[PDB]
Amino acid sequence: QSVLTQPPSASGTPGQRVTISCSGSSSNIGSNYVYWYQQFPGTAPKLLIYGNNQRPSGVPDRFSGSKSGTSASLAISGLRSEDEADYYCAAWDDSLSGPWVFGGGTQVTVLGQPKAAPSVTLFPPSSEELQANKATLVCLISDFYPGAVTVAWKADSSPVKAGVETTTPSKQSNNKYAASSYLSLTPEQWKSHRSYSCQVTHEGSTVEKTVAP
């Protein structure tokens, strides 16, 4: 659907200059102004570059835009963790695809951050939930990097396959990652086992927390 073409991903380590290409044709980039946007999860896009290469208020000059022929480029100099976001190009377009077109977005990852094993907290069902004849175990996984984990659940020592829901890791305010997993059970299942465990695998090694009724 996007008329302009950007790479789906770009990456670098801190202090690198990362470039993101945006290609189109004569009716858009070739003849018209290009714009760039930064978007963080859950937030609106923010204008980063207008008019091919101008920075609006508050955008620091380590972001630079350029254009040549029918392709444009955003350069993120001095890369740092706060630059992890999606970046979109856009342009006016004089063809039938116009009047305004977007690229498909580029997700920027910043590598070379300090590795960190996860912290795991496992909450039992609350007394309130049990009194409502339901039960959820809540496994919260925090302060890890890189942002990838797997979660497995056990009842006593037996693997539990059903009733599990697991979120994709996302960044904490401190730029490390967190994730969550839930196990739904009946109150009688909760009460009838000696313990339940959540086992988190990160970078090949595991951290497992156990709770007991």
Binding site: A90, F102, S142, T167
Partner: protein
């Protein structure tokens, strides 16, 4: 000081219409156009059209097959987008944004999530995740709240009416098999504070017009 403030998230049945509003401030409303851009969850930005606040000219994206109408009210500095004959493929965050020739689409509203579904709104069930000796790790203790079985997105969570922010993480929601969402919010606090400090999670689910303030107390 340019700001565009949109109306709240909404759920709509297939075949219904939605009208989103966008209140502009910090500049002369008629001096710029207003564009609308939508974004399906996790996906890219799609231009829908734009209107000249000053002279009324409009241009709409062909792929919407005539289903969008854009209007403005100069007296209240508000722009509106109405999308008719809704379908589930219309589920998206809808953004208002200011438009002009030089600066392009420059300032954007905060976005409005419109969920198109035959299911009815449902407010959350909020349960405390109580601190205990088992949720404490050398000087810090975790406590939280579990926000269960709501529809549609979004929910917001604060702690102590916004006074407690350091050490807070609110997780993304998961869409369960029932078609309802659940999420959690957790705070890491000093163990010593557990006595004499209070903790209330403030859950707002605007789609169902429900707010829940749940006290989270030691077991």
């Amino acid at each position: 000081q340019v700001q565009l403030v949109q109306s709240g998230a909404e759920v709509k049945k297939p075949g219904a219409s939605v009208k989103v509003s966008c209140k502009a401030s910090g500049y002369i409303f008629t001096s710029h156009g207003i564009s609308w851009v939508r974004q399906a969850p996790g996906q890219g930005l799609e231009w829908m059209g734009w209107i000249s606040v000053y002279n009324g000219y409009t241009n709409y994206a062909q792929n919407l097959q005539g289903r969008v109408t854009m209007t403005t009210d100069t007296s209240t500095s508000t722009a509106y987008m109405e999308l008719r004959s809704l379908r589930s493929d219309d589920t998206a965050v809808y953004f208002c944004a200011r438009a002009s020739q030089i600066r392009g689409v420059d300032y954007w509203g905060q976005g409005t999530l419109v969920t198109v579904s035959s299911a009815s709104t449902k407010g959350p069930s909020v349960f405390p995740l109580a601190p205990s000796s088992k949720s404490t790790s050398g000087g810090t203790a975790a406590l939280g709240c579990l926000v269960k079985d709501y529809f549609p997105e979004p929910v917001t969570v604060s702690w102590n009416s916004g006074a407690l922010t350091s050490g807070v993480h609110t997780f993304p929601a998961v869409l369960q098999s029932s078609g309802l969402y659940s999420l959690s919010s957790v705070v890491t606090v000093p163990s010593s504070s557990l006595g004499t400090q209070t903790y209330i999670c403030n859950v707002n689910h605007k789609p169902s017009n429900t707010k829940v303030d749940k006290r989270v107390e030691p077991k």
